[PDB]
Design a protein around this ligand. Sequence first.
Ligand SMILES: [Fe+3]
Length: 186
Amino acid sequence: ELLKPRTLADLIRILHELFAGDEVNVEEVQAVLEAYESNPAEWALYAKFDQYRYTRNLVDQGNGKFNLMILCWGEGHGSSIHDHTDSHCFLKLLQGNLKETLFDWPDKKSNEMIKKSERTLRENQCAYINDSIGLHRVENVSHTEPAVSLHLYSPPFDTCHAFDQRTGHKNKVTMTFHSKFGIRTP
Ligand SMILES: [Fe+3]
C-alpha cells in the first residue's frame, strides 16, 4: 500500500519499506518520490552548496540497500556524462530546474557522443535512469537559480565512469560526499 509521504522523514520510512526485500519495484519507488511535495524546511540541513561545483550530501544509507542524497547545484553547475554502476538511479527535483541530456553507450571506436535527447526536469518531478537505458549528463543551466535534487541509488555505489564527449572514452571516478547526515565531511 503506497501512501503519500507527508514529509521527508515519512518518505524515508516508506523507502525503507520498499527496499526491505532484494528487488526493486521501480514504478512504485518513482511514484512515492514524485508524490513527496518538496518542503524546503525539511531538507535545509542537507542543502550545503559549494561555489565551484555541485555537492553531494548524504541523507540516509537505507540500511545498506540504497544511498539517499541531496545534490546542490549552483548556477551553471553540471555533471559529466556518466553511468550508474549497475544501479537504479532516481532523481527528484526539490528546487529549481535541471537539464538532463541522454546519451547511448559508446562503441569501442573513438567518436563524438551525440545526444539522443534532452529534457528539462522541473520542481517535484522524479526521473529514472539505469545502465540498460543509457548514460546521461545533468546540468543546472540557470544563470540565476540554484537547483536542489534528491537522488536515490540502489544498490549504493561509490564510483562510476565519466565519459569524454569528444571520444566516448571513459575514466573511473570516485564519488565523494560533501556532508553526511548534515555534517560537513571534508
Ligand atoms: Fe546520474
